Amino acid sequence: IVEGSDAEIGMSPWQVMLFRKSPQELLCGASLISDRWVLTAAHCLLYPPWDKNFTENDLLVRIGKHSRTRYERNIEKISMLEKIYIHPRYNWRENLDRDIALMKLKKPVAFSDYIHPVCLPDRETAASLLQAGYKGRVTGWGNLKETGKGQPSVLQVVNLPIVERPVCKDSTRIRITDNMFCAGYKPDEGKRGDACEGDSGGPFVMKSPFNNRWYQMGIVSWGEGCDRDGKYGFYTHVFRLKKWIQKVIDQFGE
Amino acid sequence: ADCGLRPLFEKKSLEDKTERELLESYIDG
Amino acid sequence: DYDEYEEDGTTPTPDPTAPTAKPR
Ligand SMILES: *[C@@H]1O[C@H](CO)[C@@H](O)[C@H](O)[C@H]1NC(C)=O
Ligand code: NA
Numbered sequence: 556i557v558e559g560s561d562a563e564i565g566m567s568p569w570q571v572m573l574f575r576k577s578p579q580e581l582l583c584g585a586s587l588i589s590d591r592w593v594l595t596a597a598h599c600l601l602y603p604p605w606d607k608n609f610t611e612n613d614l615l616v617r618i619g620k621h622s623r624t625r626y627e628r629n630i631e632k633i634s635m636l637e638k639i640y641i642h643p644r645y646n647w648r649e650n651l652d653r654d655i656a657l658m659k660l661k662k663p664v665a666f667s668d669y670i671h672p673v674c675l676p677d678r679e680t681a682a683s684l685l686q687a688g689y690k691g692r693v694t695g696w697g698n699l700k701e702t703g704k705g706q707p708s709v710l711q712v713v714n715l716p717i718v719e720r721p722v723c724k725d726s727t728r729i730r731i732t733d734n735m736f737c738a739g740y741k742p743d744e745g746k747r748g749d750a751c752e753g754d755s756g757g758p759f760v761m762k763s764p765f766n767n768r769w770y771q772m773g774i775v776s777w778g779e780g781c782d783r784d785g786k787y788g789f790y791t792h793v794f795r796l797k798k799w800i801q802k803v804i805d806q807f808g809e
Numbered sequence: 810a811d812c813g814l815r816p817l818f819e820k821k822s823l824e825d826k827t828e829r830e831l832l833e834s835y836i837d838g
Numbered sequence: 839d840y841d842e843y844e845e846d847g848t849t850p851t852p853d854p855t856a857p858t859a860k861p862r
Contacts, residue, residue: 565817566825588812589813597860644843649852651859653841667816674813680839688838697862714830716838728857734841755862761830768813777859778851789859 556695556711556754557782558747564621564792567694569673569771570710572617573599573658573756575609577674583696584757586771587618587672590663592804595756596774596791597645597656604647607805611636619669623696624708630669635661640803641774642796652732654776654791657803673760674770682766683796684761684772687719691738691761691772693788699751701781726787727779735776736793737787750788751781759790 571585593616600609619631637659646652648705664670676684694712698705715738723737731737738759740746750757759773772796773790780786793800818825852858 560827563817563825565815568815569815596861602861644849646849648849649856649858651861652849654861668810669816671844672812676834678839685836686834690834690838692827692831712827714827716834729859730856740822750832750862752862762828763813764832764835765818769815770813775862777861779860788862791843795839798840 556693556697556698556713557749557751559711559713562621562694562712564743565669566712567710568619568671570620570694571757572620572696574615574617576613576615577800581623581696581753583755584697584775585616585658586758588666588675588771589672589804590666591660593658593660594771594774594800595656595658596645596654596776598651598654598776599756600639600656601641601645602647611639611658616660618664619667620710622709630667632664632670634664637661638715638807641809642799650730650732651735651777653734653796655774655796655799659807674768675797675800676770676772676794680763680770680779681772683765684763684770685717685736685794687717689761690714690716691759692806693750693754693757693759693775695750695754695757695775697755697765698751701751701783704748715748715788724785726785731789734792735789736773736792737789738773739787742784743805749778749782750775781806
């Protein structure tokens with residue numbers, strides 16, 4: 556996260572860290588959407604151009620963490636994965652269309668002050684909140700700059716506005732799709748912030764004024780550099796893909 | 810249907826340091 | 839407002855002249 560700030564303890568209790576088992580390595584962010592399902596980006600699991608093709612046997616998650624340099628006794632929880640599910644029409648070869656994956660925990664996690672699921676959007680919330688200029692919130696342990704420090708100890712948080720699709724489209728020569736949206740400040744708005752390398756798979760959330768619940772509207776997916784003027788971060792559009800999400804959970808919930 | 814309500818914030822009637830900036834964007838953004 | 843895809847179909851073969859997105 557670039558130009559963010561330290562999270563407060565328990566500020567993002569759905570935050571999940573995805574690790575490679577061996578060698579142990581933090582790969583990606585992720586989010587807790589029930590006591591046994593974790594949402595992340597497909598490219599965190601499958602990206603052939605980088606020779607990446609992880610199965611559930613290769614990975615684990617850590618849940619409830621705030622600071623990644625000390626074990627947080629009686630707070631953090633560690634879980635293996637029973638199965639992973641990648642969107643069947645995920646497009647790694649060009650534009651990361653449908654960059655979404657689900658991971659089933661090997662055993663359900665108990666909720667606590669530090670571990671609690673985020674909501675997925677319903678039709679009402681998506682229609683009401685997914686508007687240009689409305690702000691959401693991105694969290695992660697990724698790079699503090701595009702290019703001494705580099706990686707933060709404590710979870711980073713930044714609030715960023717959703718951007719109009721024509722501005723997103725004009726900002727990049729990549730062919731973008733309706734399954735992604737972009738967010739970030741415009742060059743004339745005099746504020747900054749972005750996700751960056753290592754934040755992918757983490758959540759873009761919004762707080763509903765209608766019921767005071769936090770909803771996950773996006774997944775950190777890609778960008779061109781980080782926090783550049785006239786560039787924006789791109790996020791998987793969670794609600795667009797919710798029928799696939801529900802199909803996997805409904806069919807494989809056991 | 811407990812989702813999205815944080816034990817250390819919404820359930821305590823406590824706001825975090827920057828969530829008001831999000832709420833304000835529904836009026837100004 | 840929901841993504842639709844055919845059960846059988848495939849992701850499009852990328853235009854070799856088109857730039858590709860780099861994941862974060
Ligand atoms: C990825 O690996 C799994 C097992 O490790 C294999 O079944 C699958 O065919 C592989 N897919 C790709 C695209 O490499
Ligand atoms: Na920018």
